[PDB]
Design a protein around this ligand. Structure first.
Ligand code: DGD
Ligand code: CLA
Ligand code: CLA
Ligand code: CLA
Ligand code: CLA
Ligand code: CLA
Ligand code: LMG
Ligand code: BCR
Ligand code: BCR
Ligand code: BCR
Ligand code: BCR
Ligand code: OEX
Ligand code: CA
Ligand code: CL
Ligand code: CL
Ligand code: FE2
Lengths: 32, 341, 39, 60, 78, 450, 334, 35, 37
């Protein structure tokens, strides 16, 4: 089916969201 | 410079992984043992030796994989790949349990190599070799349990299988058939291990809670320097604390650390002596006086006699599956069991 | 990234840890599917 | 009924955008002049989104 | 305190290590995969496939009993 | 405030200790964590709703939040059958959205808001030594907790009532009209032995007592809130206690450990605030049900269960408790204190009544006993139900088991945390939390013990 | 000044050979009570009807037990979790027959050990120490509380508490395995790691310190006399021990900070024991070890055994025999 | 600067890591075997 | 299950509750990016 596929897409977007925030702050020079 | 000394120089170089002469024995043998165990638990079955699946390939998990002991039909055959059983056929060698002696023997020689490494490095750096002496404990356990016990028994089949649930099976087997808990030598082993853990905990905590104020941070870890000459914690305060709490205390640091070595090592050695006994079925199975009294007096019950009954039940119910080569056939009506259960 | 020519070590750590978490998740998923799943 | 699904997906997309932006906006004092109003704006919009969804729950 | 070799952090933060390994590591992963998925592991190690634990003529455990002739015994077990 | 070891004296792994004196940053951390709590509530509720089969009992489906909502009287009717799935969904949604708001506020305070609040406002600024301000915050929060208790009371009285498993005609959502304000009962609950047959407050067995105790709790909490707003700690309290942020944390940790232990016991034993309709049987209930199931079966087969002696000479089906009551035989003799709505119609003044056992047992009671016996809170860590020697085909672990185990573990580790922080708070107040000063090592000025 | 102040000064005095303290004012009476009763009962208690089936079990030496088989027997299953003090028995003989000594001893012992942990904190405070030895002690206390209090509570009877005897301990363990599969419980696995590793680290630390002792003696006298009580100079060479160990495994795996090393020595067994205590405490609520019975099926659907199935056979054998007369109904729920 | 690439350490690293990754790929593949 | 209008985002509700685990992980990620100062 597609339930694991959709589930994994949501999970991966979530997994990236946090590290993406940290990486953007580190690269653009925001306070950390 | 003779070739021997040139080799000695190369082997004893200061590198990330010290090799030494002992490494010649340790590293290939340790690698064989570890890779054999991983290979067996990943790919190799026990279907023909035990009638059991024992690898990830068959659906088992970390808790249920094992390099299982070889078939009981081989007695104490060393089961070389080129031996008369497998005759050089690697697949058959896997199927008959050749991996068990492979892992056991390479591990025994890797253990030898590791203790030789302890000796070699101690000699090179210029310290006393008490680490090797301490490691003799694990060596005694490995020799007694993985070599001496099965050699006393009918075959390697009754050796512990190199797996988590295999070890648990060995443990329960020793309880049910040998009453190993009742064995005074196991009792001394238990005392040694529990006392070693106690000593570890209490010493670590005592040191951490009698530290000297040597820094300004709430983080006291950065107030130590490995080259500092002075004690980093107060032995005097520690001694007073434990004297008033427990009644007695260490006053000699050297004695304390020697005791921390002595306790678990002595425990391992005593339990190894007990296992040697069990290899010959020389068990501390029973207290004859209580057995006789119970056989005559049907009102006499102790926790000892209860444990005997548990052992009887375990043997009868487990033997047919645990010893499939025996073709034990126990009809349902001969199985011992309590009421309603 | 923040410095040219090298990867930050923490970026490498995050990626490797995500991969390790993924392999562990795959093994735990496999405990419930296929062989060894009791079904 | 498809408008309800569209509003739901919009709310999830804007919640993702918010989850990403809000910590960066609060953690960049230098670009705080143009990210303080956006904050306001976005919050309002997110609020509006929730409201729409709620109403559409009873419309669908 | 370094015995001579390059520090690991240096190596694994370098571009070249990753150009090499973004290939080598997945290649080994998928080689192990294929080793399993082609059935090669079953044949190499003699491990039964799920349909070969029992046969239409042997319904019981194929426990070895012979001390030296295990090849024939295994082949008769199938 | 610094954000590294040299300027704070705390390592990264103790980095939150850096917040002890940054009141605004600490408020941000607290609000963001509250957001995490509310987020989990909402997300877990939505997950459970999504994974809910509304005609299969809740306890068979790994649900711990939906039973809480059902017990409150939302979405359930007689015997606990799920009427409307929408209230569960609304509770989950509301928590999720407010969690978003709480997280935003916590992030604001932790990341951009003022570092400390004391020079911005006297009302929200606080100092740990400010005994008056600390008691003011206790007072505000005591008022809020009293409000929450009265919210439960209002739901039970005027907003549809709560689920009463003891309801006549069958357990059902009913409106509590006569809560017991009688202080004798309410506070004699607190005086009952924490042992078998008494069960200190775990033994509360009727929604009237629960609602009346909550009315009392609301009044006590609100009056204590006002008391602490308008007073400062007395001399005895000032002399006995440590007055510091870590000390207050340690006190709360002790409190939390106590509460966690109590909740684990509560869910394990109590079937009133935790109806077995939603949480499944208690272990005691399941044992009693097995005894009842086989009493009924053997009686239908013709066994005279009154006079049948078992192998030991005690009655197979019935026996006496040590105080004389007629109870189920077998090992379940230990569980004779059990009371459940399906068993009490057969209990007389002396215990189990032979006449009711012989001609009052209903088919629904037989069905309930079978269900409860087969859902005994026994199960493996990988959720294989039954006794541990059973095989893999029954995927069940009681919610009571999950809740009791988790809350016992949390209670213990919060006792450990209390010990850690109480010891540290004392040592820091006395000024030796960083080690023994070599110059003034106290033991060196102490006489030798012998 | 006042009589109360003088008493306070006495109880909290760091000059007492044994520190008393406020926690001591509870520890000492309760521990002495538990000890006196334990000795008397172990020697001379009559048999106890542990299973509540009028099948009394002889625990004391005078009734035919040796030291290994003797025990203070847990109170009767008929009592369950009821409070059974001496004054609730019609006679001392009744109290003894139903296992009252077990309850007396256990309750006093548990009060005493919690007060012992409090007393450890108290003395560390009086001596100006850091306060966390009692935290390490909370691991054994947690385990003892699990086996004497929490497990009986979850199971609904003090009859299911660990007996106060050697063979009784073994019986407890065997039945616990039969009913909960503790071996296959990861918290017990962590406890085993805790104790095996604690012994490993004890041996390792002791051996490295002993190996790196500074020469201060001759080959005739004990090297222990090289250390003098109350010296600040270090009695061993930690840098030489680090050199050895970092070459035994590799450099970065060896501690060179004694403080971090001793923190690790404290933390490892303590955490392991906390986990195994929590394991016992949660199996008290019958959340048992892993059950992989019949997890592996062949393609047709026949079960292929694993070592877990063999372990289950052993567990069943233990289970069907335990308390052989106590069960009337087919499921061991209580 | 300019350290050797291949060493005894390199060999000790790979001797373990390389079969480890191969085995992990094999076990991953195992996860999707059906009976 | 979820009421009918919402079962397009069933696979998102399936993963929502584990998010606080990721926050705990993100704390360590952030500390790793700052070099664990
Ligand atoms: C500082 C303060 C320290 C204070 C110390 C005072 C003692 C505290 C501990 C009490 C010990 C109780 C032992 C027996 C408990 C028990 O019989 O059972 C549990 C009791 C509840 O009792 C039960 O209560 C039940 C109530 O249910 C009854 O009523 C219900 C109503 O729905 C149902 O109808 C049910 O069927 C019916 O039987 C029954 O009465 C049972 O017979 C009765 O046993 O819990 C209770 O009362 C009290 C809650 C106990 C908490 C758990 C102990 C905490 C342990 C922590 C260990 C930490 C270690 C850390 C080390 C480091
Ligand atoms: C509930 C968990 C929690 C919370 C609420 C906090 C909160 C805080 N910590 Mg912290 N910490 C934690 C766990 C937590 N910590 C853990 C587990 C560790 C061990 C790894 C630490 C170790 C630690 C150290 C070493 C320090 C702190 C510090 C701080 C404070 C400053 C934060 C900062 O400036 O860094 C900035 C980080 C960022 C800007 C990265 C982005 C973070 C954002 C908030 C991510 C949010 C994502 C979210 C999905 C977006 C939703 C927004 C909206 C749409 C809803 C702050 C109040 C510092 C301090 O004490 O200040 C003096 C400090 O030095 N902590
Ligand atoms: C316990 C939680 C808590 C506490 C103690 C504070 C405290 C503070 N906040 Mg903050 N905040 C919070 C949560 C909290 N906040 C949350 C969840 C958000 C996200 C919406 C915010 C977003 C926020 C912003 C953007 C700002 C503050 C500011 C402030 C400071 C000034 C307060 C003030 O005078 O405004 C006035 C107070 C009122 C007008 C009272 C209104 C009460 C609320 C809003 C209405 C609802 C009341 C409710 C019924 C009571 C119970 C709540 C219920 C959920 C149980 C102050 C120290 C300001 C600041 O730092 O100044 C420099 C500021 O800029 N907060
Ligand atoms: C979380 C809520 C909360 C908190 C943190 C506090 C905190 C405090 N209160 Mg309190 N209080 C509250 C709610 C709260 N209160 C409510 C709701 C009321 C209304 C009834 C009161 C009415 C009140 C009064 C009249 C007083 C306080 C006082 C105090 C201060 C010292 C009291 C003390 O030492 O504690 C601990 C208690 C003791 C040290 C006395 C010993 C109590 C017994 C011996 C403990 C035994 C308990 C037992 C083991 C547990 C079994 C449970 C049950 C069977 C009893 C302290 C800061 C005192 C103060 O300073 O005045 C401003 C004070 O005189 N409060
Ligand atoms: C409300 C409860 C509470 C609060 C507010 C605090 C707050 C604090 N504690 Mg504390 N503590 C608590 C409960 C609490 N603690 C409990 C219950 C224990 C017993 C275990 C402790 C034991 C403790 C110790 C030993 C120390 C503190 C310390 C501190 C300070 C800094 C801690 C820090 O930065 O965290 C950083 C966060 C981490 C390093 C991450 C820890 C991760 C844990 C160990 C595992 C998480 C397991 C969890 C169940 C999730 C499982 C994951 C699974 C999926 C794999 C800080 C003020 C330090 C201190 O004393 O400061 C002066 C310190 O040394 N605490
Ligand atoms: C009180 C807390 C609690 C309780 C009682 C439950 C109970 C349950 N959950 Mg749940 N959950 C929780 C919190 C809780 N959850 C949290 C915080 C999350 C966010 C991650 C979730 C997300 C979640 C999902 C997605 C699912 C569940 C499911 C379930 C059911 C199956 C349980 C299971 O097999 O898990 C397995 C057991 C384990 C994995 C063991 C966990 C052991 C931890 C690591 C203990 C930590 C030890 C200690 C605290 C370490 C710190 C100490 C330190 C000092 C060293 C069950 C009723 C399932 C279900 O059936 O849905 C309907 C399901 O799919 N939960
Ligand atoms: C922050 C603020 C958040 C919101 C605060 C409270 C708002 C809740 C209002 C809902 C009231 C129900 C209206 C319809 C109605 O009467 O009942 C309609 C239905 C069914 O409820 C029925 O109401 C009837 C009204 O007389 C009768 O009482 C019936 O007996 C009853 O069954 O209710 C629901 O479906 C709503 C469920 C209630 C859930 C609300 C609690 C969760 C919200 C707070 C949590 C967030 C906290 C953030 C931190
Ligand atoms: C058999 C044999 C042999 C040998 C071999 C070898 C030696 C090999 C090998 C091998 C190997 C050597 C393999 C390996 C492996 C591995 C693995 C299988 C792994 C794993 C893992 C994991 C799973 C991990 C996980 C984790 C954890 C849990 C923690 C944290 C995270 C991580 C992820 C890290 C020869 C040929 C000689 C001959 C014949 C016989
Ligand atoms: C500060 C800090 C921190 C912390 C943080 C936190 C703690 C947080 C949080 C937060 C939060 C707490 C959040 C949140 C959120 C939420 C959201 C964002 C939401 C939403 C929404 C939505 C979108 C929904 C939707 C839906 C609906 C409507 C219903 C149906 C279903 C669905 C889901 C679809 C850390 C540690 C990192 C570190 C650094 C510092
Ligand atoms: C709602 C409810 C109810 C009610 C309840 C109540 C009414 C309650 C209460 C309660 C209370 C009213 C409580 C309490 C508490 C207390 C505590 C918990 C305490 C304490 C203590 C302490 C902690 C102290 C300490 C100390 C000492 C000992 C001395 C020195 C100083 C210090 C502070 C350290 C009932 C059951 C009816 C039913 C169910 C529901
Ligand atoms: C409600 C909702 C939402 C929200 C979400 C959120 C709220 C968020 C988030 C998120 C997050 C919050 C994420 C995260 C993450 C993470 C991660 C993935 C991590 C990690 C990792 C690691 C692997 C680490 C590692 C390490 C360690 C720990 C050791 C050392 C260092 C290192 C770094 C190596 C959305 C929008 C979806 C949509 C709608 C619904
Ligand atoms: O009591 Mn001593 O162990 Ca506890 O599981 Mn039911 O109960 Mn009797 O049968 Mn098996
Ligand atoms: Ca779904
Ligand atoms: Cl027994
Ligand atoms: Cl029974
Ligand atoms: Fe030491």
């Amino acid at each position: 089916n597609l339930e694991p596929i959709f589930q994994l897409t949501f999970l991966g977007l979530i997994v990236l969201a946090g590290p993406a925030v940290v990486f953007v702050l580190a690269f653009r020079g925001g306070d950390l | 410079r003779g070739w021997f000394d040139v080799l000695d120089d190369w082997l004893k170089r200061d590198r990330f992984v010290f090799i030494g002469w002992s490494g010649l024995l340790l590293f290939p043998c340790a690698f064989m043992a570890l890779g054999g165990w991983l290979t067996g638990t990943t790919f190799v079955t026990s279907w023909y030796t035990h009638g059991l699946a024992s690898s990830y390939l068959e659906g088992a998990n970390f808790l249920t994989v094992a390099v299982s002991s070889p078939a009981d039909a081989f007695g104490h055959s060393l089961l070389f790949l080129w031996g008369p059983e497998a005759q050089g056929n690697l697949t058959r060698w896997f199927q008959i349990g050749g991996l068990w002696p492979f892992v056991a023997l390479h591990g025994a020689f890797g253990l030898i190599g590791f203790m030789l490494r302890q000796f070699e490095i101690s000699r090179l750096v210029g310290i006393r070799p008490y680490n090797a002496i301490a490691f003799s404990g694990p060596i005694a356990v490995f020799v007694s349990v993985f070599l001496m016990y099965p050699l006393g028994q009918s075959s390697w089949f009754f050796a512990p299988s190199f797996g988590v649930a295999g070890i648990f099976r060995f443990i329960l087997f020793l309880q049910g058939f040998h009453n190993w808990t009742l064995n005074p030598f196991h009792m001394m082993g238990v005392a040694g291990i529990l006392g070693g853990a106690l000593l570890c905990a209490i010493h670590g905590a005592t040191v951490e809670n009698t530290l000297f104020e040597d820094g300004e941070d709430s983080n006291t870890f950065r107030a130590f320097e490995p080259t500092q000459a002075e004690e980093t914690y107060s032995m005097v305060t520690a001694n007073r604390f434990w004297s008033q709490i427990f009644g007695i205390a260490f006053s000699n640091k050297r004695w304390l650390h020697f005791f921390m070595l002595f306790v678990p090592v002595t425990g391992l050695w005593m339990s190894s002596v007990g296992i040697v006994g069990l290899a010959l079925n020389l068990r501390a199975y029973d207290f004859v006086s209580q057995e006789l009294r119970a056989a005559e007096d049907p009102e006499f019950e102790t926790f000892y006699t209860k444990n005997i009954l548990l052992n009887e039940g375990m043997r009868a119910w487990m033997a047919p599956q645990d010893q499939p080569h025996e073709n034990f056939i126990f009809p349902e009506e001969v199985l011992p069991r309590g009421n309603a259960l | 990234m923040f410095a040219e020519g090298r990867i930050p070590l923490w970026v490498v750590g995050v990626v490797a840890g995500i991969g390790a978490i993924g392999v562990l998740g795959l093994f735990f998923y496999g405990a419930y599917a296929g062989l060894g799943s009791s079904m | 009924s498809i408008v309800f699904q569209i509003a739901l997906a919009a709310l999830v997309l804007f919640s993702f955008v918010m989850v990403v932006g809000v910590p960066v906006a609060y953690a960049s004092p230098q670009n705080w002049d143009r990210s303080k109003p956006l904050l306001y704006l976005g919050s309002g919009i997110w609020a509006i989104l929730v409201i729409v969804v709620a109403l559409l729950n009873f419309l669908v | 305190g370094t015995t001579g070799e390059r520090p690991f952090s240096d190596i694994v933060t370098s571009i070249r290590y990753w150009v090499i390994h973004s290939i080598t590591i997945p290649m080994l992963f998928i080689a192990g995969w294929l080793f399993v998925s082609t059935g090669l592991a079953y044949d190499a190690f003699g491990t039964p496939r799920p349909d070969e634990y029992f046969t239409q003529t042997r319904q019981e455990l194929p426990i070895l009993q012979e001390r030296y002739d295990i090849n024939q015994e295994i082949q008769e077990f199938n | 405030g610094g954000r590294d070891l040299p300027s704070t004296g705390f390592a990264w792994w103790s980095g939150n200790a850096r917040l002890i004196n940054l009141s605004g940053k600490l408020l941000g951390a607290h609000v963001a964590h509250a957001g995490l709590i509310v987020f989990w509530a909402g997300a877990m509720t939505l997950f459970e709703v999504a994974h809910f089969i509304p005609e299969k009992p809740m306890y068979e489906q790994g649900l711990i939040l939906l039973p809480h909502i059902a017990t409150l009287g939302w979405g359930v009717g007689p015997a606990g059958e799920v009427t409307d799935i929408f209230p569960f969904f609304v509770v989950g949604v509301l928590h999720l959205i407010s969690s978003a708001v709480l997280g935003l506020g916590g992030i604001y305070h932790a990341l951009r808001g003022p570092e400390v609040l004391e020079e911005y406002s006297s009302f929200f600024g606080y100092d740990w030594k400010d005994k008056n301000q600390m008691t003011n915050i206790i007072g505000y929060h005591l008022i809020l907790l009293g409000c929450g208790a009265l919210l439960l009371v209002f739901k039970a009285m005027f907003f549809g009532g709560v689920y009463d498993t003891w309801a006549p005609g069958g357990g059902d959502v009913r409106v509590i009209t006569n809560p017991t304000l009688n202080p004798a009962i309410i506070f004699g609950y607190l005086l009952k032995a924490p042992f078998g047959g008494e069960g200190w407050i775990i033994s509360v067995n009727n929604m009237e007592d629960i609602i009346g105790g909550h009315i009392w709790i609301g009044l006590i909490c609100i009056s204590g809130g006002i008391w602490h707003i308008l007073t400062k700690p007395f001399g005895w309290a000032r002399r006995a206690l440590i007055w510091s942020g870590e000390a207050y944390l340690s006190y709360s940790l002790g409190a939390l450990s106590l509460m966690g232990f109590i909740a684990s016991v509560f869910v394990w034993f109590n079937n009133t605030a935790y109806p077995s309709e939603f949480y499944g049987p208690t272990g005691m209930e399941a044992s009693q049900s097995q005894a009842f199931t086989f009493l009924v079966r053997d009686q239908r087969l013709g066994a005279n269960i009154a006079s049948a002696q078992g192998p030991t000479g005690l009655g197979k089906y019935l026996m006496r408790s040590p105080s004389g009551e007629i109870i189920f035989g077998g090992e379940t003799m230990r569980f004779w204190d059990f009371r459940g709505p399906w068993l009490e119609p057969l209990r007389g003044p002396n215990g189990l009544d032979l006449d009711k056992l012989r001609n009052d047992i209903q088919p629904w009671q037989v069905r309930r006993a079978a269900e409860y016996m087969t859902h005994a809170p026994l199960g493996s860590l990988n959720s294989v139900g039954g006794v541990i020697t059973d095989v893999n085909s029954f995927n069940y672990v009681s919610p009571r088991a999950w809740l009791a185990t988790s809350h016992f573990v949390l209670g213990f580790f919060f006792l450990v945390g209390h010990l850690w922080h109480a010891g540290r708070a004392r040592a820091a107040a006395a000024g030796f939390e960083k080690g023994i000063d070599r110059e003034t090592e106290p033991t060196l000025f102490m006489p030798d013990l012998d | 000044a006042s009589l109360w102040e003088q008493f306070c000064q006495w109880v909290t005095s760091t000059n007492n050979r044994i520190y008393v303290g406020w926690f001591g004012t509870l520890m000492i009476p309760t521990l002495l009570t538990a000890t006196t009763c334990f000795i008397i009962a172990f020697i001379a208690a009559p048999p106890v009807d542990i299973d509540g089936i009028r099948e009394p079990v002889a625990g004391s030496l005078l009734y035919g037990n040796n030291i290994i088989s003797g025990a203070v027997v847990p109170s009767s299953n008929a009592i369950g979790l009821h409070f059974y003090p001496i004054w609730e028995a019609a006679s001392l003989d009744e109290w003894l027959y139903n296992g009252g000594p077990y309850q007396l001893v256990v309750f006093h012992f548990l009060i005493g050990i919690f007060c012992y942990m409090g007393r450890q904190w108290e003395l560390s405070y009086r001596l100006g120490m850091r306060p966390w030895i009692c935290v390490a002690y909370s691991a054994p206390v947690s385990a003892a509380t699990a086996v004497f209090l929490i497990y009986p509570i979850g199971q609904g009877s003090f009859s299911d508490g660990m007996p106060l005897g050697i063979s009784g301990t073994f019986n407890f363990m065997i039945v616990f395995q039969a009913e909960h599969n503790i071996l296959m419980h990861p918290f017990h696995m962590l406890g085993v790691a805790g104790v095996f590793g604690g012994s490993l680290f004890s041996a390792m630390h002791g051996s490295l310190v002993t190996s790196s002792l500074v020469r201060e003696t001759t080959e005739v006298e004990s090297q222990n006399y090289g250390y003098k009580f109350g010296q600040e100079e270090e009695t061993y060479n930690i840098v030489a021990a680090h050199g050895y160990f970092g070459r035994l495994i590799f450099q970065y795996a060896s501690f060179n900070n004694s403080r971090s090393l001793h923190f690790f020595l404290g933390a490892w067994p303590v955490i392991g024991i906390w986990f195994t205590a929590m394991g016992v405490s949660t199996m008290a609520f019958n959340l048992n070890g892993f059950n992989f019975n019949q997890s592996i099926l062949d393609s047709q659907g026949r079960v292929i055994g694993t070592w877990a199935d063999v372990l289950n056979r052993a567990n069943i054998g233990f289970e069907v025999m335990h308390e052989r007369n106590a069960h009337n109904f087919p499921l061991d729920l209580a | 600067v300019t350290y050797p690439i291949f060493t005894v350490r390199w060999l000790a690293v790979h001797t373990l890591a390389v079969p480890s990754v191969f085995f992990v790929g094999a076990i991953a593949a195992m996860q999707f075997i059906q009976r | 299950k979820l009421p009918e209008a919402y079962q397009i985002f069933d696979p998102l509700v399936d993963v929502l509750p584990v998010i606080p685990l990721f926050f705990l992980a993100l704390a360590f990620v952030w500390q790793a990016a700052v070099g664990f100062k």
